Amino acid sequence: IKQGIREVILCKDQDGKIGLRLKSIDNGIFVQLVQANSPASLVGLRFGDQVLQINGENCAGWSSDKAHKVLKQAFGEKITMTIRDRPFERTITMHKDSTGHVGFIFKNGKITSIVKDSSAARNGLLTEHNICEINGQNVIGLKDSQIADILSTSGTVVTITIMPAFIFEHIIKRMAPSIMKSLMDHTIPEV
After folding, report:
1. Which parts of the sequence bind a 1,2-diacyl-sn-glycero-3-phospho-(1D-myo-inositol-4,5-bisphosphate)?
2. CA distance 103 to 98
3. Residue 143 annotated as binding site
4. Is 26 annotated as a binding residue?
5. Closest Cα partner for 27 from 162, 170, 133?
6. Rg for the chain (alpha carbons), in Å?
7. Domain 5-84 carries which CATH code?
8. 108 labelled ligand-binding
9. What is residue 145's three-state secondary structure?
10. Looking at the domain that runs over 90-183, which CATH code has it been given?
């Protein structure tokens, strides 16, 4: 999780799309969904990013409906956003034991217990936190088993990006679980 603002510059695709759903949270605007192969994934927008401005207008106090209407009406050519990096989230680095375990139990992407004397214990992983990213790959909406697969087929260093469950649940409210698995960009970014 970077420490400052960044500016990003999008262009709507052929279909006048950018691949973004936004959510009003505590009088700010946050990224709820980044669509695979969209302008918003190509420029590197993430789940949980805060949008401070759209085309130099402040988003403070906008409804989810208004932010969406603003993106709709924008002159396509070039949209500028001022982004604050995933401010509700944190990154923990752990190391698999010789048995390949980092040392937690999770259910519906939510960490529920920390195993005694694991890397997860030594690194202070918390329960009641949703897993957002593993090794910078977004896993929101994947089945628990696919999350285990990504952990398995990670090497012995495992970086996990987590969000307190109350905040997570407030962000995904009103978005169909099926859109999450289907359309939430789960890919490793392109170079």
Report:
1. 108, 143-144
2. 12
3. yes
4. no
5. 170
6. 17
7. 2.30.42.10
8. yes
9. helix
10. 2.30.42.10
